[PDB]
Design a protein around this ligand. Structure first.
Ligand SMILES: Nc1ncnc2c1ncn2[C@@H]1O[C@H](CSCC[C@H](N)C(=O)O)[C@@H](O)[C@H]1O
Ligand SMILES: Nc1ncnc2c1ncn2[C@@H]1O[C@H](CSCC[C@H](N)C(=O)O)[C@@H](O)[C@H]1O
Ligand SMILES: Nc1ncnc2c1ncn2[C@@H]1O[C@H](CSCC[C@H](N)C(=O)O)[C@@H](O)[C@H]1O
Ligand SMILES: Nc1ncnc2c1ncn2[C@@H]1O[C@H](CSCC[C@H](N)C(=O)O)[C@@H](O)[C@H]1O
Lengths: 253, 253, 253, 253
């Protein structure tokens, strides 16, 4: 069922994953040489063995795989932040999303997945090299069909109209507030990710100026604690990622 | 555009949301009486008035309104927990999900909206009053098309096959592990939400025993702090919801 | 034995405490009337019974009982914040402490307990009613031996010299930095408690300006989670106190 | 004023501290030889110079210095946890404390500082090399007067009686419960520090068997978030110490 050119997740015995394109070349590993040609005509769930006899399993790549293994220009918007943006903004299949700060394309890949083949994500970017690398990430993930990158400064305006969500992770989201109020559907969401307290203060004040266009804003911070579970001791993992950014939501009119 | 029988969200000046089916009747509010018939023939983004001069904005119902306004039992799975289920398990449009513990239909509604018209959710439930209640909400939210509620003890087995995700909020997820291993696609996710660390210990024991059926399980705990942001003062809100439940993820072999 | 005028802690069957003054007057309770005079001749570890038959145990009042049961114009600086102030700044028996913001006298009580009968806490306060209130609180607790309340505005200066610590919980702690710099012993701690980010920002501004007077400042934030532990279920408590204030520490060169 | 044999902290133009016993010798350091003969007869707040020009400040050793610079091999109980133990148990000058797990002496130092010259700390230990290292640390910090270490297993029993607090950092505190019930004064505190949920569950089980000797227990967990305050950005430190141990408190009768 797998043909040349298709993408595949190879899982080694230790649980390490390789998101691979099937082709006539021999992939090198910790644990021997895979001949990726042997994968043609196999099914997901079958295995291939390296030259030293270690078994690698073939999985269909999912969004988590693409997200986990893309070329990143550190940092990004993290899974957990993307998650709450989706939840509290209620992003849905079919939604039309404008986003600014395409970066590596991480938030874009996640949002593209949520809106499906019939949703649209339009990403703004001002940095040429980030646009060229994001686009390569989005083609690689197959979202080629639903995402458009505009090499354009969103501060100067939003061309689009009747958008479901404006989602931002750039330095000054306050400079987009006025444009978002025009672009957004009634009941549409303005969403911003900001690492600093200062950015929140500014944004909240701008959103107060635009009380007539937005509902009362909401700013959250998400923490995720991994648990270390064993036979005897169950306890939280000693260190954790405590802070990425704040997320501010505001409903339109 | 708005016709009889459609569902609409009315927003009052304060920002109180009313989820209403538009029909020929009068609706009684703390800001006076409304005639829903005046909504008919109008478009989203427009306003109707009350017999005290107070305006009511008309918005298209989004998933977040349904989750906010549905009938409930006591405990539920909160948006943040479902958010991370979605993010960490890679729940995508078109997915086939098995969930047990429908309860009030909160989680099921969340997942139904993520999977889209072409995804499917099958929910098991042992408690006949909950099943009726949950089904009441999904027809109401319009996910009629994609959701099926089984009145069946999931511990007896999972009749579905090639499922993308098995997602549990029930007292003993360990008693579903063997079943889910057979039901899940290669690469699919077992996901369990458990309030106590006892549950997690027991569940981790079962997954340990099924080592050759799942990758290394990870267990997480998610906290969300709201921020009180004023002109003079930005502090985290004094009080917060600090624990709902632990979430455990395991990918199938 | 216990005599008239002694202060005592009555613990009821449900574990509830009552800090009481022993005297010929009968005290009214959920569980019946207590003849407090019957607590004369009795000793710590003994009990007395209400007219409804219920037994109240007699304990020696400790610092936690005074802190837990005093008259507040709430909220105070919470015992979690005061603990970390003590621990991080090294507050020891015999210390000479200047604090400003006597308020209810809660912080003052805590530090007074720490410094001991031979230590000194000098508390500044600009409000006559608070000063009366707190002084009544500290008498009540037996600390009038070691605490001084100066009805004076600390922004105008600190009369004391060679102080161990300057501990602040007032709105503009930056206006005390210079005075604290000159009041503190070498190795003495400037400590401020500030509910808002904004206050931390200004206080960091001022401490940068006086870098030649202070080591690098450190701002913490402390959360305490309660656990629900029962035979079956052990989980963190659902709701917690998430924020009181930030605490900044600065060592004098 | 400062004579031979006394202890002194040296602060350099970076901020780093060195705690030494003052005696005539060319002290080897990163910024050049010190020669601690220029220091004798000086006062605190003065400066002494090396051969490379730079200046070193003389500070009086506080409890924070001893806890920083001590030989601290084995994992300590953390300052934040010591703090809440002090706070919630109401540990006061002059208290009599039995503690088990002397470890390196860290928790023993901190407690010995709080109970003061007239308090007593009896530390139990079963490991020789730990006991030798612990006694060598407390003598160095000057608490020889108030601390005794017993090379004896606390599970076998508690020799002392009428004690203020039993403070534990060992693997099975539930075995010390009955002994503590005998040793503690009316209103005294049993305090145990456990890194695992399991340990807490066992302990709570024992404490409830001893409901007639103890008030309902209270288990807590403390987190400290460091704040990053730069001129143009305030945010929490990205990473933070999230879990060290749970702490359980119970009042005797
Ligand atoms: N006005 C604008 N329009 C479109 N993209 C923008 C933009 N301003 C910035 N960007 C892009 O948005 C991305 C994130 S900017 C980096 C944000 C950083 N975490 C912070 O602390 O603020 C970058 O790729 C940047 O080039
Ligand atoms: N074996 C089973 N099959 C299907 N549904 C079940 C089930 N056991 C419980 N449920 C349903 O799942 C929902 C949540 S059960 C309550 C969960 C609890 N907090 C715990 O984990 O301990 C209820 O609606 C209940 O009827
Ligand atoms: N310059 C100053 N000198 C002395 N006390 C001051 C002061 N500024 C404020 N205070 C006192 O410090 C205390 C804390 S004020 C900050 C907390 C807040 N205003 C509240 O009341 O909850 C108050 O009792 C106030 O009267
Ligand atoms: N019954 C007992 N009496 C006295 N000390 C004990 C004891 N059981 C354990 N200890 C000591 O208590 C301390 C903490 S024990 C828990 C930490 C971990 N097991 C470790 O050693 O790294 C150790 O110093 C240990 O030697």
């Amino acid at each position: 069922m797998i043909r040349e050119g298709d993408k595949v997740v190879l899982v080694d015995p230790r649980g390490k994953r390789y998101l691979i394109t099937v082709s006539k070349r021999d992939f090198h590993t910790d644990l021997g040489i895979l001949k990726l040609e042997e994968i043609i005509g196999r099914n997901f769930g079958e295995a291939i063995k390296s030259h030293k006899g270690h078994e690698f399993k073939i999985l269909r790549p999912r969004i988590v795989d693409y997200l986990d293994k893309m070329k990143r220009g550190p940092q990004i918007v993290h899974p957990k932040d993307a998650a709450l943006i989706v939840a509290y903004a209620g992003i849905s299949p079919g939604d039309f999303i404008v986003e600014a700060g395409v970066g590596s394309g991480a938030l874009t890949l996640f949002l593209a997945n949520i809106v499906g083949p019939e949703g649209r994500v339009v990403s703004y970017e001002i940095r040429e090299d980030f646009a060229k690398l994001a686009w390569e990430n989005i083609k690689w993930a197959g979202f080629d069909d639903r995402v458009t990158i505009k090499l354009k400064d969103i501060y100067e305006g939003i061309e689009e109209e009747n958008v479901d969500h404006v989602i931002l992770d750039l330095p000054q989201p306050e400079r987009v507030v006025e444009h978002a109020a025009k672009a957004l559907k009634p009941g549409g969401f303005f969403v911003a990710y900001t690492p600093c307290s200062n950015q929140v203060m500014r944004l909240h004040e701008k959103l107060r100026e635009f009380k007539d266009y937005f509902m009362k804003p909401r700013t959250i911070n998400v923490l995720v604690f991994d648990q270390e579970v064993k036979k005897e001791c169950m306890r939280p993992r000693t260190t954790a990622l405590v802070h990425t950014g704040y997320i501010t939501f505001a409903r339109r009119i």
